[PDB]
Design a protein around this ligand. Structure first.
Ligand SMILES: C[C@H]1c2cccc(C(N)=O)c2C(=O)N1C1CCN(C2CCCCC2)CC1
Length: 348
């Protein structure tokens, strides 16, 4: 029976929870009677992405209502939804098409988790917790709560909660140190860059099996390029709550997972307003969306030579900008090394 510490065992159960996967699908309005968890396929999901691509194009370019209807119908025949009372919303506005894109990204991660859970359980010798642990191909350790390491992380959470994100405050339940197999090796060249920072990335718990096993990923050339304020890459925050928002917790379901990654940012192409980034300027390594509030440059510390912008959020001076808070975007998966996973309690 499992040799893993209690918190890690619990983490593995959380990541692989079948009930959580179905709840996700239900919130996305999928009909679980006609499309059960069991039936999700990678091939089908990918096809959905093309239909969404095509219908986004038609909406943007002023295609005919019948082209839009035909594509709506095809989307809903491939992925059965249950709208209960209501009429099926048509895929005729960009806001709603982007929500569908989001849904497909979540289904792919759910498909990944479910398939791992169901595959490769041959070994009756090993505890199934340990079998499942091993499928994440990630070394995980509990960070002792009284160590200076934990103390720095806790302050980053305490000080960098945003003003406008006041629905809840946050408590760190547990901190894990994580190392994804092959990731150190893959990140290694980027140690030569300057301006390596420890930044937040939030996602739903049901994505974590795919994230640990596959790393953070960049959207395929095949999804609509439509709602990405700064193009398709990996997005991070220096304010805990801006990331924590993307955990999709509730009063009903208050436990989330959030990452701290070392992001090798180098020379930041700084920006104020949405811009569909295709290639980066010469000698630029990353994009920063500038915000009206950010941690205080004064308090910024270092953890293992990585900058930790753990200062209380102060005004930025810049105001001629769309964004309320910073975000940071990289365009090569190799520029991210995940360092910690935190279990968070959202008190609403
Ligand atoms: C805003 C940005 C961001 C900034 C900082 C941190 C995080 C973080 N996840 O922690 C995130 C984050 O996840 N962002 C997403 C970017 C992609 N979109 C959509 C995807 C579907 C297609 C249209 C766009 C959703 C929000």
């Amino acid at each position: 029976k499992s040799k893993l510490a209690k918190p890690i065992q619990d983490l593995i159960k959380m990541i692989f929870d079948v009930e959580s996967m179905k709840k996700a699908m239900v919130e996305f309005e999928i009909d679980l009677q006609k499309m059960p968890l069991g039936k999700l396929s990678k091939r089908q999901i990918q096809s959905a992405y093309s239909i969404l691509n095509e219908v986004q194009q038609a909406v943007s370019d002023g295609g005919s209502e019948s082209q839009i209807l035909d594509l709506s119908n095809r989307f809903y025949t491939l992925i059965p939804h249950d709208f209960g009372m209501k009429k099926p919303p048509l895929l005729s506005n960009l806001e709603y098409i982007q929500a569908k894109v989001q849904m497909l990204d979540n289904l792919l991660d759910i498909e990944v988790a479910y398939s791992l859970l169901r595959g490769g359980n041959e070994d009756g010798d090993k505890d199934p917790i340990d079998i499942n642990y091993e499928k994440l191909r990630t070394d995980i350790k509990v960070v002792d709560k009284d160590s200076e390491e934990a103390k720095i992380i806790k302050q980053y959470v305490k000080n960098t909660h945003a003003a406008t994100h006041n629905a809840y405050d946050l408590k760190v339940v547990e901190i894990f140190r994580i190392e994804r197999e092959g990731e150190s090796q893959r990140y290694k060249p980027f140690k030569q860059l300057h301006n390596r920072q420890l930044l937040w990335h939030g996602s739903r718990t049901t994505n974590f099996a795919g994230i640990l096993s596959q790393g953070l990923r960049i959207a395929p050339p095949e999804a609509p390029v439509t709602g990405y304020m700064f193009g398709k890459g990996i997005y991070f925050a220096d304010m805990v709550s801006k990331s924590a928002n993307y955990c999709h917790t509730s009063q009903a379901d208050p436990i989330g997972l959030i990452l701290l990654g070392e992001v090798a940012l180098g020379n930041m192409y700084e920006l104020k307003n949405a811009s569909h980034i295709t290639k980066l300027p010469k000698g630029k390594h990353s994009v920063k969306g500038l915000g009206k509030t950010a941690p205080d440059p004064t308090a910024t510390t270092t953890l293992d030579g990585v900058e930790v912008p753990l200062g209380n959020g102060i005004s930025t001076g810049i105001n001629d900008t769309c964004l309320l808070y910073n975000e940071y975007i990289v365009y090569d998966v190799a520029q991210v090394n995940l360092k910690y996973l935190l279990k968070l309690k959202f008190n609403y």
